[PDB]
Amino acid sequence: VNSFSGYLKLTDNVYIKNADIVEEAKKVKPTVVVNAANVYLKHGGGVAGALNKATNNAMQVESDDYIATNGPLKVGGSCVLSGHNLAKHCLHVVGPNVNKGEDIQLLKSAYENFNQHEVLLAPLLSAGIFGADPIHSLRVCVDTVRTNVYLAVFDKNLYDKLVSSFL
Numbered sequence: 001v002n003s004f005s006g007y008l009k010l011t012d013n014v015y016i017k018n019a020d021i022v023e024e025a026k027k028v029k030p031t032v033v034v035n036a037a038n039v040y041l042k043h044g045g046g047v048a049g050a051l052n053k054a055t056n057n058a059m060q061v062e063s064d065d066y067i068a069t070n071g072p073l074k075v076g077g078s079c080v081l082s083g084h085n086l087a088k089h090c091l092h093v094v095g096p097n098v099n100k101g102e103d104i105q106l107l108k109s110a111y112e113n114f115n116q117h118e119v120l121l122a123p124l125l126s127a128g129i130f131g132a133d134p135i136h137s138l139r140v141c142v143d144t145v146r147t148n149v150y151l152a153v154f155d156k157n158l159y160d161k162l163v164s165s166f167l
């Protein structure tokens with residue numbers, strides 16, 4: 001049992017809140033926080049940059065070692081690294097960068113990684129700088145993830161739209 005509070009129920013297993021994922025992670029200290037990564041684990045902005053800053057760059061230092069050993073992730077792929085001061089683990093997941101021509105269908109493959117974890121605190125993959133339609137990312141999440149996922153949506157206007165859209 002985790003201390004997640006104030007979430008709206010979307011489905012049996014998907015919950016959503018208008019919150020900063022960093023603040024949710026700090027408060028709840030979940031087993032798994034999801035990062036919306038790129039294949040290089042170069043955590044520059046959005047969720048990744050905010051998570052990394054909250055770790056005082058430890059996430060990036062760890063990621064640099066991961067890449068030196070293993071090379072880049074696949075689009076749609078993932079790796080499990082430490083959650084540092086935020087969570088036990090961070091699941092770094094790469095959605096497609098639709099703005100750079102990557103196939104939106106890979107967003108389903110990206111969300112499938114969530115099924116390897118019983119409970120996750122997560123963002124909407126690809127819905128920010130990667131350019132996927134946010135409601136589409138939410139619908140793929142709902143239709144793909146079967147484990148318990150707590151979605152933190154930073155943007156108030158976006159949240160208000162998402163929660164009054166069909167799934």
Ligand SMILES: Nc1ncnc2c1ncn2[C@@H]1O[C@H](COP(=O)(O)OP(=O)(O)OC[C@H]2O[C@H](O)[C@H](O)[C@@H]2O)[C@@H](O)[C@H]1O
Pocket residue numbers: 019020021022036037038042043044045046047048049050095123124125126127128129130131134152153154155
């Ligand atoms: N602190 C936050 N808390 C919750 N949601 C957030 C936060 N910040 C942004 N969002 C929302 O989270 C959603 C995802 O936005 P993005 O983080 O851009 O992820 P992507 O998968 O599209 O792009 C990946 C790149 O982003 C990084 O630069 C990486 O290093 C990658 O290169 C949007 O709805 C945001 O409003």
